[PDB]
């Protein structure tokens, strides 16, 4: 079909209720994909949640280093535009997985981290603080970490981090964006802040280079973000948007992305919004 047609269908499917029914039909995990390393004894407590585990085939491996991390490569192709948006989708680091987290950032010299969670919710820890408050310095896995600046806006915090390999003295800089107005299992507190945020992340991409995206589990809020960025790329190029196909393609790479029907409904309505704005 066309962008125009796909959007008529989405509009009708949201009134019809069929869009949600089909979302609830979709598999959460791709059947037949091995999940083995994540379940080994030495790796079980490296998972924040027992039911959110990487597939063997797309799990992130550390360079020259056997340590397991709950993280997955998620690549979203738009072939009609010779385009691939790369991500690494991961959970919120635990106290004892911060070393592996920063090792991924260093291995691939990732310049952008997107964190879609507060550190705590209702008196419970959702993510370990894996960076120091300025001006303090932090040791993780043989990396020294400092926050060179920190600025709060309405919906998110923008931080610049310096990562130093202690043995070599080689330095790497990373932009860190923490979206604090988006509860676990829910939708963004404000759709317009969300859409501005997503477009901002797009503008900070460097081609070829994955964006590291995480929340608490790294599937619900991360899935919504990935869906929306994909839809934005498609709408600007007058290409058809089928959100169910987008969700499935993510779930083929990390199970359960986009967690709730409310999240899916949210992102579909946001997709329609942006389409109506673009003409």
């Amino acid at each position: 079909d066309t962008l125009e047609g796909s959007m008529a269908q989405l509009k009708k499917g949201l009134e019809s209720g069929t869009v949600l029914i089909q979302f609830e039909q979709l598999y959460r995990k791709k059947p037949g994909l091995a999940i083995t390393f994540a379940k080994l004894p030495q790796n079980l407590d490296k998972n924040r949640y027992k039911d959110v585990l990487p597939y063997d085939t797309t799990r992130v491996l550390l360079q020259g280093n056997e340590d397991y991390i709950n993280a997955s490569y998620v690549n979203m192709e738009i072939p009609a535009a010779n385009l691939v948006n790369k991500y690494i989708a991961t959970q919120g680091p635990l106290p004892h997985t911060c070393a592996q987290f920063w090792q991924v950032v260093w291995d691939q010299k990732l310049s952008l981290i997107v964190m879609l969670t507060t550190l705590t919710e209702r008196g419970r820890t959702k993510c370990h603080q894996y960076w120091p408050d300025p001006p303090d310095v932090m040791n993780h896995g043989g990396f020294h970490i400092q926050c060179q600046s920190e600025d709060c806006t309405i919906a998110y915090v923008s931080r610049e981090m310096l990562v130093t390999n202690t043995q070599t003295g080689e330095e790497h800089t990373v932009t860190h964006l923490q979206y604090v107005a988006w509860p676990a299992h829910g939708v963004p507190d404000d759709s317009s802040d969300f859409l501005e945020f997503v477009n901002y992340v797009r503008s900070l991409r460097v081609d070829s280079e994955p964006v590291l995206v995480h929340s608490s589990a790294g599937i619900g809020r991360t899935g919504v973000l990935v869906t929306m960025e994909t839809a934005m790329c498609l709408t600007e190029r007058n290409l058809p948007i089928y959100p169910l196909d987008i969700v499935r393609k993510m779930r083929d790479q990390r199970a359960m992305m986009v967690q709730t029907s409310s999240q899916y409904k949210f992102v579909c309505e946001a997709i329609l919004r942006v389409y109506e704005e673009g003409l």
Binding site: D45, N47, Y49, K50, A217, I219, Q259
Partner: peptide, 6 residues
């Protein structure tokens, strides 16, 4: 260990 979906 806890489940996220719970």
């Amino acid at each position: 260990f806890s489940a996220y979906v719970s």
